Curated annotation (Swiss-Prot), chain C:
Species in which this protein is naturally found: Saccharomyces cerevisiae (strain ATCC 204508 / S288c)
Gene this chain is encoded by: RPB10
The entry's keywords: DNA-directed RNA polymerase, Isopeptide bond, Metal-binding, Nucleus, Ribosome biogenesis, Transcription, Ubl conjugation, Zinc
InterPro entries membership: RNA_pol_su_RPB10, RNA_pol_suN_Zn-BS, RPABC5/Rpb10
Record-listed cross-link Glycyl lysine isopeptide (Lys-Gly) (interchain with G-Cter in ubiquitin), residues: 59
GO CC annotation, single: nucleoplasm
Family membership noted in the UniProt record: Belongs to the archaeal Rpo10/eukaryotic RPB10 RNA polymerase subunit family.
Protein's name in the database: DNA-directed RNA polymerases I, II, and III subunit RPABC5
From Swiss-Prot, chain D:
Role played: DNA-dependent RNA polymerase catalyzes the transcription of DNA into RNA using the four ribonucleoside triphosphates as substrates. Component of RNA polymerase II which synthesizes mRNA precursors and many functional non-coding RNAs. Pol II is the central component of the basal RNA polymerase II transcription machinery. It is composed of mobile elements that move relative to each other. RPB3 is part of the core element with the central large cleft and the clamp element that moves to open and close the cleft. Seems to be involved in transcription termination.
Annotated effect of mutating residue 9 to E: Transcript termination readthrough
Name of the protein this chain belongs to: DNA-directed RNA polymerase II subunit RPB3
Family statement drawn from the similarity comment of this UniProt entry: Belongs to the archaeal Rpo3/eukaryotic RPB3 RNA polymerase subunit family.
Superkingdom assignment: Eukaryota
Residues that hold Zn(2+) according to the record: 86, 88, 92, 95
Alphabetical list of Gene3D superfamilies matching this protein: DNA-directed RNA polymerase, insert domain (2.170.120.12), RNA polymerase, RBP11-like subunit (3.30.1360.10)
Keywords, ordered alphabetically: Acetylation, DNA-directed RNA polymerase, Metal-binding, Nucleus, Transcription, Zinc
Main location: nucleus
Quaternary data: Component of the RNA polymerase II (Pol II) complex consisting of 12 subunits.
The species this protein was found in: Saccharomyces cerevisiae (strain ATCC 204508 / S288c) (Baker's yeast)
InterPro entries in the cross-refs: DNA-dir_RNA_pol_30-40kDasu_CS, DNA-dir_RNA_pol_insert, DNA-dir_RNA_pol_RpoA/D/Rpb3, RBP11-like, RNAP_Rpo3/Rpb3/RPAC1, RNApol_insert_sf, Rpo3/RPB3_RNA_Pol_subunit
From Swiss-Prot, chain G:
Description of its domains: The C-terminal domain (CTD) serves as a platform for assembly of factors that regulate transcription initiation, elongation, termination and mRNA processing.
Function: DNA-dependent RNA polymerase catalyzes the transcription of DNA into RNA using the four ribonucleoside triphosphates as substrates. Largest and catalytic component of RNA polymerase II which synthesizes mRNA precursors and many functional non-coding RNAs. Forms the polymerase active center together with the second largest subunit. Pol II is the central component of the basal RNA polymerase II transcription machinery. During a transcription cycle, Pol II, general transcription factors and the Mediator complex assemble as the preinitiation complex (PIC) at the promoter.
Organism field: Saccharomyces cerevisiae (strain ATCC 204508 / S288c)
Name of the protein in question: DNA-directed RNA polymerase II subunit RPB1
Residues that hold Mg(2+) 2 according to the record: 139, 141
Cell compartment(s), UniProt: Nucleus
Family assignment from sequence similarity: Belongs to the RNA polymerase beta' chain family.
Highest taxon above the source species: Eukaryota
Gene that encodes it: RPO21
Annotated Mg(2+) 1 binding sites: 139, 141, 143
UniProtKB/Swiss-Prot annotation, chain H:
Annotated positions of the Phosphoserine modification: 135
Top-level taxonomic group: Eukaryota
Oligomeric form and interacting partners: Component of the RNA polymerase II (Pol II) complex consisting of 12 subunits.
Gene: RPB2
Transmembrane parts of this sequence: none
GO MF entries: DNA binding; DNA-directed RNA polymerase activity; mRNA binding; ribonucleoside binding; zinc ion binding
Additional notes on this entry: The binding of ribonucleoside triphosphate to the RNA polymerase II transcribing complex probably involves a two-step mechanism. The initial binding seems to occur at the entry (E) site and involves a magnesium ion coordinated by three conserved aspartate residues of the two largest RNA Pol II subunits. Present with 18700 molecules/cell in log phase SD medium.
Keywords tagged on the record: DNA-directed RNA polymerase, Magnesium, Metal-binding, Nucleotidyltransferase, Nucleus, Phosphoprotein, Transcription, Transferase, Zinc, Zinc-finger
Protein's UniProt name: DNA-directed RNA polymerase II subunit RPB2
Family classification: Belongs to the RNA polymerase beta chain family.
Binding-site residues, Mg(2+): 53
Source organism per UniProt: Saccharomyces cerevisiae (strain ATCC 204508 / S288c)
Compartments, as annotated in UniProt: Nucleus
Amino acid sequence: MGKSAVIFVERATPATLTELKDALSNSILSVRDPWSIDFRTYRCSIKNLPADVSKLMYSITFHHHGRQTVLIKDNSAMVTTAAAADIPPALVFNGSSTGVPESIDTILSSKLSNIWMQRQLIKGDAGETLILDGLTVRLVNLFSSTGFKGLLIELQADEAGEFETKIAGIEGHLAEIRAKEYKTSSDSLGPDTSNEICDLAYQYVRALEL
Amino acid sequence: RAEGPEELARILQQLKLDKIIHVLTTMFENTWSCSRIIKIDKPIRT
Amino acid sequence: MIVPVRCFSCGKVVGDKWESYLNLLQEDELDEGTALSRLGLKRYCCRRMILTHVDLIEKFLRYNPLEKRD
Amino acid sequence: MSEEGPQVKIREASKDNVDFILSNVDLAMANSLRRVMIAEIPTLAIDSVEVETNTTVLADEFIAHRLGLIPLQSMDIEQLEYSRDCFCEDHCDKCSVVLTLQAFGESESTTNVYSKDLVIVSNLMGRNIGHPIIQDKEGNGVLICKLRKGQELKLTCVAKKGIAKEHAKWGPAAAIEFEYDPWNKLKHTDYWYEQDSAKEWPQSKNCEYEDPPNEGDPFDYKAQADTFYMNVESVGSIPVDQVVVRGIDTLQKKVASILLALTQMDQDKVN
Amino acid sequence: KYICAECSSKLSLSRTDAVRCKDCGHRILLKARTKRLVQFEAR
Amino acid sequence: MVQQLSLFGSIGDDGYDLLISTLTTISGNPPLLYNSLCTVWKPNPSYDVENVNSRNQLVEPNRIKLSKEVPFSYLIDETMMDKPLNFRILKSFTNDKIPLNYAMTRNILWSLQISDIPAAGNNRSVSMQTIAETIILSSAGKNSSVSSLMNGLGYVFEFQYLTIGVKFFMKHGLILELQKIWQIEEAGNSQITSGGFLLKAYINVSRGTDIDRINYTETALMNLKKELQGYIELSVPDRQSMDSRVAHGNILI
Amino acid sequence: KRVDFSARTVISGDPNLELDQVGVPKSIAKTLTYPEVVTPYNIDRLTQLVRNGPNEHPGAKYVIRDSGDRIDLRYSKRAGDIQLQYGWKVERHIMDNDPVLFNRQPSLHKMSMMAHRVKVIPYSTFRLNLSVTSPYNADFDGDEMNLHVPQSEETRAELSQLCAVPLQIVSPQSNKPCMGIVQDTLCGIRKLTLRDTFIELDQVLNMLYWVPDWDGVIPTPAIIKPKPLWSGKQILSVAIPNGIHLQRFDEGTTLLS
Amino acid sequence: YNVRMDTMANILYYPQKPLGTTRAMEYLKFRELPAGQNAIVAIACYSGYNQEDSMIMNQSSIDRGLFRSLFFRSYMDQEKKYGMSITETFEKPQRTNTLRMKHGTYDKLDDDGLIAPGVRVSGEDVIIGKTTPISPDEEELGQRTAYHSKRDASTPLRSTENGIVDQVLVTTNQDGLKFVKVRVRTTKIPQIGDKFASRHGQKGTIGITYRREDMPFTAEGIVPDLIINPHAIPSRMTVAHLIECLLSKVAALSGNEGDASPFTDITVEGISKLLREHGYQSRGFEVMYNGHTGKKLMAQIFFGPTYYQRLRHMVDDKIHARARGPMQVLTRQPVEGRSRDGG
Amino acid sequence: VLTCPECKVYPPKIVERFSEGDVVCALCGLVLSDK
Amino acid sequence: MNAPDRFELFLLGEGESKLKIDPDTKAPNAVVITFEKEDHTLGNLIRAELLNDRKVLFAAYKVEHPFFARFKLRIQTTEGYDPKDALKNACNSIINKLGALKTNFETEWNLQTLAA
């Protein structure tokens, strides 16, 4: 079972990504294609709500994992696809689907706009992915509406035996570059049920919260 | 899809060069970690 | 109408100095130019703010929003 | 010492004013520095008011506009967030400050409502911010309104973070003097005279810091503007040295944003 | 609710009562501002 | 999102077998069995949606359809494993009773779908309807379930039904469906399409702006209808019957 | 008689606008319309315009069918629903480079009612080039002028091929130009071309960039050594087209003035 | 002005008594109720946005409260008594028993039918609820239903007027009928298209506004509150404008009221002498730098305070457009009137 | 009596646009009577 | 009222690129670069720095209308040298100069405080 972790640095500089790319250059084995990610928050527009019912809904869009959206609310996850190649053949065959769906963000922001309204949008484009010995590291700069926000690091490994050691090593590597205020997370949404992309989205939410 | 005789000659020269490079790189890897990331601005004087 | 808080031209603040400026005029019996310069008003735009102010708030105050005649 | 870079000579300083010379620098750089020092440095100011009781002789937006210009301490403004970015609804605890104003004219003699009576009721989280700026001897600060017998005013204020490119209320610098070439060696200005131009035009205080030109010297057609004389005064919210340093930092961040966008676009072109 | 015009006395009037003040007997009556402050957005 | 161009009709079960043969004579394809299960959800009345812009009518509340395929092992009783799994089994599906009951469907709790009333005007020869669709692949969390998800969005369950029928694929992407519909409640199961089959022939268009394609689709549908003249009458249904907004309640069945 | 599809507002001056272009405020552009016909060449942009709605510029306000029925887009929720066909009409807002007719009262002569191309701008005033204020006998201390919108293709062609500002320069009352450089541009073009005025490198570069018809060639200076300088006549000659010849001899001027 | 419910009223936030006053003003009381403000004016050419009587203004000055005016309006209504029965009532109408209701929002009305002070009214809202009883024999040609026992007679706001209701008054007239008066407040801020004038027949409109960074500045960091064109001086021969500028500058620098009465002994040379005592070029010129690049300007600039008045014509009251709308009863042509959205 | 010929709903819901001289059904947006 | 919001001066709209580079069709090795939400403060600085490179031939900027915050820059350099590289060098030099200026001012201010 693969494991993943996410570390977000808030006080980063524009050139910190290059600094961390060069500081790891000795162990860098290869480089792969760039990636992107989107992060929306939707708000509840109804006022007759109970106290225990949350008001937000976080939508995370993964571009490299085959164009998939994940909706998060109160530690509850939902995974939607929008590509014609991800459709289970039964739904196509029986007639439950017309074959060319839409992203759930269009549905939230077009038809249900009287229940949910957008509040923010944080984007990340042209990230870099590096293959190290039994590890893959992805770096990207986060841009909000106002401007630069911070640095995002996501780590993924296939063997879970020595994940903590790798996390500690990367933390130390950030330490020599004097990035001392960083928030990390490797939590799991469900102890018994393990879905990789849902756990990744939950870790993103836990890292990016203010 | 090559267009020029000079282009064809350059293509064949590069063919010989990178064929030799591939042969020796395979020789090293079958025994060695090369680097495919480093690019130097100025070629090293012979 | 109460004294403007800020100067319309150089961004400075003159609002708080009105009370102390009025003091120098009759307690110390000074002239207007020296009193204006005593409070750090050096650009003539700040002197313009303080010097030419019509204080109309002391007339509305003897009055009520209910029953003016004609 | 950094001998390859811009040089600076401070001659005078105080809580409000800094008076200095900037040498070995282009004219474009000094002009951009002053433009940024006036226009693009964040500060904390009142951005919304809601009123409960108004038995005064003034309007409501009148007092709102008067409140929107009062200066408040904004030393640690780097730890607040733009309210358009904070995930909170309306105003946050991390993306706003809140004050309250209450006054009542119990006495027969009229009572002045100053700015010392703004009381902060939100949680500051140990940040030095939100205090009103007071510069007069008596400590009363900006006078806000006037009251009589039987008149009351009650209202609540929300103060936020912004720049001066959207309203004049967030500006931390009053007026900055910018001079150079007091002898007109470069022939940048052409004087207007009746009889003798050398006498009608007074002399700047700065002439003592350069040597007068000699009539036997032909016009030097190779010089460039290199020495500037500046003076900067602050409204009071930010210390003036911090005004200069933050202007330099903001210019640096703008150029770095340009650099980052260019690198991103080059990576896109690589694809 | 309402308010007198001379002494500003606090009065409450129905839909049928005479429009007069009880203490001074004047014929000029003013309203009272909305006690519950209501927030608005200028659009 | 598609523009679906459709024509409707119905037949009595007596001719059913005959009809099937004729279809195979035209299409050149054999029928394929299928089934499905649809659940309809409506906005929660406990929540007051003042956001409906009453002075402008920017939007009106609507109903959401969630569909799923169910294996035939839930629909075949102990008397029917002997027969092979083909279309003839539909001949035994004439009773209002069905193996799938309320408790099993409650135990189950996909494709999410929203639609609008067809286009107005009397110069339309086929029912043109707009559909917005998405797919739910999986989920997780402490309350991972369709019911909990739709309550999180703000919707509640209204009813459900079960469709069983056969499909014919013809040229140009034309799909012809023969259906039987069973409404399901705790009180029991009732076949609304009693003693007959509901016939629906339709095509999908991916982009509504392309008009050459839409004209071609209408030409194909009208040619198909003119082929079946004298056997079955294919007609445009009532525009006011295919309206699924919450304010007004009716259900074409 | 009174008419429809018209507006009236004060004027102002804009030196950055071209000669035959008028700045139209945003709201006045949101109120007046134009009935564009849906065709294969515009159905995508027109569809996006209908989706935009009537509260956004650009947008649309009504949709007319083939049969004459007209659907108000505001009440009909179908901004995202109406599918357009060939021959329908979208009543869209007025968009950049739409011809308009523009005048000032009293309209004493032919040259007081001229055509213009629109440019949508903020704020509440109209914008004009500072050289058309002579035919209109208008200044900017409170004058209001009138705007009329054509509603067809023939009418638009008439406004674009007959009444355009470019075609109204040589007036037929006295067979001489009715427009020219006026006021402060005239006061400046004279201070520029004295023999006294010399220009350094950076300003010459900026000035040559400002001329939108430049060809990327830097004129060789007139004083190469000991310092490169340019004369005002040299930079101003860039605006003047090529092939223009002019001779004028004043009092007491020889071939070396 | 606080009490009076006039049909219209304009008030200025901060009025300033002029720096140059005639001696006669002490009898017109113009230093008690002024009508303008002392504005720093630089006569110059700058970017070409002030030609043909336009002017350029400093936007930071606008933001700090220069030339900002309150506006006050009022409406009246009363119950009419046709015959012996009261044919008009002040009560909030209900759609159950009323016909011909207006599209305005009746929600802001109280139970008395009168809105309360402190509510942001807007376009086409109603502030007075008036209902007319109708005799049963009167039917609107089939429009009336069984339960529509009354008609609406409310008074909506003018289509453009926005602001906050400021006062409501209830009284009775000579006949004892009820009487309501509503006063509404608003704030007006200068913008492109307004109208300003000096005391010498020199008026114009704002043509563009600039921020303090693009404004040319002097070596002392002073910035002109407005900039006018010099092509307005020669043909008008308003030398008194220049003399007023010079004398006001000297009075501001010195700090005492400067006489400018007619037929007196003050001369131009005398005030120029008094000017040079302070340290400025005698003819009022000054050295100013470009705002964009920061260079020096080749020509010096005439600079100094003046007095300006904000006239009564705003662009918000002159702007009008019409696509379609109401017609006329007889000729069936678009109606007359801007407030009635005519052609 | 004035009814929408497409909604066919009784009693009809109708809004008059005075500033445009139109009568508009409040459901389909159709324009019934002009001027 | 038609007054646009002020925050459109410093907040990019969605789908807006802060830079846009377009080759110039008239002169070889020339590019036109549009900057958004920026004014003379940046363009003057960048052009004055680009005028110091001996391999840079042409460098000029303009702000077409004072209503909108955006401006155009035009660069032309010698053969075998990329205008984007010239822009990068200019930005690096400006950043180094500003850093040196900040260090000098801090040293002088601290010395004055010691002498205060």
